[PDB]
């Protein structure tokens, strides 16, 4: 509640880049006089928890994959997957792994997680050949094609991405019976961060 809010007010997730786009009008509160938009974060919070409630519905978490093509999203996604039961892929995405059933890796999931649809549009594209729902960490300018759960947040900031995935994992663990809601955590956001 208040402590959870204090644990994420200090970051830079509030700030969203320019190019307002059209389908993020609801999520953007206004454009600052400088020219940079700001997210409500009061929509981000329950978008986070509903994304978690649909992640937890997958019986085996290894059936959910998380992708990121950015250097400071790679650490976040790998550590998020390790802390939850999911298995993630970072860096370069080979563009056949969702539709080509012969290649040795394949690994078709039941749910996809995307750090930035602009940067990894390939995975978002391939999800529409296999009925993968796709949750995306959408920014003020990110396209919303083939994404169902838009999380309005910053996709550039290393701290923004790290906190984003950290509280996503924390909320999925809360939805699990692993730890009670009230108890404070012992895993630091800087640990999720990028070195």
């Amino acid at each position: 509640k208040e402590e959870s809010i204090a644990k994420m007010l200090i970051c830079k997730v509030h700030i969203g880049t320019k190019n307002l786009e059209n389908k993020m009008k609801r999520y953007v509160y206004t454009r600052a006089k400088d020219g940079v938009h700001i997210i409500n974060l009061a929509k981000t919070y329950e978008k986070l928890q509903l994304a978690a409630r649909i992640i937890v519905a997958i019986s085996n978490p290894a059936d959910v994959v998380v992708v990121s093509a950015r250097p400071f999203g790679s650490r976040a996604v790998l550590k998020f997957a390790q802390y939850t039961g999911a298995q993630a892929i970072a860096g370069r995405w080979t563009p056949g792994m969702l539709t080509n059933q012969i290649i040795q890796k394949f690994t078709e999931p039941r749910l996809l997680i995307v750090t930035d649809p602009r940067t990894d549009a390939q995975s978002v594209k391939e999800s529409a050949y296999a009925n993968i729902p796709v949750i995306a960490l959408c920014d003020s300018d990110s396209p919303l094609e083939h994404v169902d759960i838009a999380i309005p947040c910053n996709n550039k900031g290393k701290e923004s991405i790290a906190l984003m995935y950290w509280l996503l994992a924390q909320e999925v663990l809360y939805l699990k019976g692993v730890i009670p809601r009230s108890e404070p955590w012992n895993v630091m956001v800087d640990m999720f961060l990028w070195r």
Binding site: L9, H14, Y29, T30, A32, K33, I38, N40, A42, M191, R195
Partner: peptide, 28 residues
């Protein structure tokens, strides 16, 4: 891949802008 990256992994592991301010004060 061998037994050299694990030790380095262990070594490596260990007011506000006014529009945001009014946004937060509106929210609560």
């Amino acid at each position: 891949s061998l037994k050299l990256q694990e030790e380095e992994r262990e070594r490596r592991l260990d007011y506000v802008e006014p529009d945001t301010l009014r946004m937060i004060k509106s929210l609560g």
